[PDB]
Amino acid sequence: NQLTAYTLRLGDNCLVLSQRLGEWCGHAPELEIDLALANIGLDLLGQARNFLSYAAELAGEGDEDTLAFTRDERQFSNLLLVEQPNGNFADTIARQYFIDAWHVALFTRLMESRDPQLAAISAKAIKEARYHLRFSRGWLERLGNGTDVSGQKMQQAINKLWRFTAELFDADEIDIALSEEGIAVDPRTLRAAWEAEVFAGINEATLNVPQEQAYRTGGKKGLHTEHLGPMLAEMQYLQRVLPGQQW
């Protein structure tokens, strides 16, 4: 159960973020970005399928689809950071950065997990994550150390997502007890590696690591922002109208 809970958190992170990038398809600044974005989303969706497929297995019931489509917002355990609106291009970049940096740190260490499947999944995943971090860092420098306008939008994109970064290092009873068994990675130990990457990246962008203390948690226990309910309605619509079918 605790292990299931955890798998789901990781899997829901990827799935939700996946959905967000789906919306950019066709709408990006240039084609290369469109293609870059489609691809990141497909990796993430891929990651989501493996975590959820495992979860479904620990549970002994359902599958990646039942978990993705027959749970409501009070059951989804994604990070609040992944559900935030795409906004303008700098908004999407900022979120992807904070996330890939986190994924890089996390999956680097999760390939060590004493649960083989988790380790197996993170081993595939870290390969992709490093490509994503290259991409999201790529644009952070480009927009902060770019034109006055762009540096400015980028500074603000970062300011407005910042309060959510608190949840990446929040550890709860499930993170602790599974981490003592060396199955999980204590989110608290991830702080160091994340800050080292991000703090550097922002300052190299000639921008400012925000002074304000972060405080937003809850996503992991089903208490989400007001943005998820509408995503789940768009994502699940068909499965809800026509449940129990093959596609």
Binding site: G22, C25, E32, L45, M231, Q245, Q246, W247
Partner: protein, 301 residues
């Protein structure tokens, strides 16, 4: 002998290459054709993108994301081939946004159900493939080689699209009705992908002579219908055509008359989604300005 040696290559069929000599009208018509081929790949992302966030299963969703990633890729390949003839990518892309160049008539139709996506994947990709296979032996090398690379990639997704439709054909009563309705809204628009009649094809004369185009618009369309109809009967579906039946004596499927008056509206920017599509691309371009500009000013330090 400049014009005379060219005539022979084309004839014995030696592929033409970027830094060869070629008639000025042959160059201009190939930028036109290949450019519009790339435009199609880019616009075609929109109807398919429309259903990404809504796709019924994580598997089907992943396939659709794959497909749209591969369309962008094929657009870029086609722009490269385009640029080998002296044009600029950005120059012709701007013409697309202005409506001074075309893209495939087919993407001015909307995706109103999940079945639409399968049917696009099966009939619309199918119709593009029939056309692209026939283009594999086009006179120009960069084009013909691009057509090979593409048919190789695109037909994996075509079989995926067909399997999606197979899933509906074999599912609940509600799923079968969904597919029948997608077919019904897409069959005729699919046939128009091949272009106008042989009696109304201004480009056809020259294209066939220069082996840019290997088969007539009607010939390819006939091929498509012949390949596709048994696929329809296999699914236990029908085609929205009272006049369709198999003609023993000619060995072809004889089919109904196309609404050319619709075709003419669609290509002239007065279809269902024409405006919504160009708007969408125009908006992506304008709102994206500050981002391209920032990327430029950064590559300068």
């Amino acid at each position: 002998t400049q014009e005379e040696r060219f005539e022979q290559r084309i004839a014995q069929e030696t592929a033409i290459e970027p830094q060869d000599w070629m008639p000025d009208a042959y160059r201009k018509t190939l930028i036109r054709q290949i450019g519009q081929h790339a435009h199609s790949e880019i616009v075609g992302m929109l109807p398919e993108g429309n259903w990404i966030t809504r796709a019924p299963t994580l598997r089907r969703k992943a396939i659709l994301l794959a497909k749209v990633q591969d369309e962008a890729g094929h657009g870029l390949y086609l722009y490269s081939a385009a640029e080998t003839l002296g044009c600029a990518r950005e120059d012709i892309y701007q013409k697309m946004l202005d409506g001074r160049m075309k893209y495939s008539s087919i993407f001015n139709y909307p995706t109103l159900s999940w079945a639409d996506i399968g049917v696009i994947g099966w009939l619309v990709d199918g119709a593009a493939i029939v056309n692209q296979v026939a283009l594999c032996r086009t006179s120009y090398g960069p084009y013909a080689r691009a057509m090979v690379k593409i048919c190789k990639e695109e037909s994996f997704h075509q079989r995926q699209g067909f399997e999606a439709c197979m899933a509906l054909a074999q599912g609940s009563e509600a799923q079968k009705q969904m597919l029948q309705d997608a077919i019904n809204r897409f069959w005729w628009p699919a046939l128009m992908m091949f272009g106008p009649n042989d009696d109304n094809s201004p480009n056809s004369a020259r294209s066939l002579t220069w082996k840019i185009k290997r088969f007539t618009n009607d010939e390819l369309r006939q091929r498509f219908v012949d390949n596709t109809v048994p696929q329809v009967e296999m699914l236990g579906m029908t085609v929205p055509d009272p006049d369709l039946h198999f003609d023993t004596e000619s060995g072809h499927y004889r089919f109904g008359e196309i609404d050319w008056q619709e075709f003419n509206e669609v290509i002239n920017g007065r279809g269902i989604c024409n405006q919504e599509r160009l708007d969408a691309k125009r908006k992506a371009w304008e709102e994206g300005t500050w981002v391209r500009e920032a990327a430029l000013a950064h590559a300068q330090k």
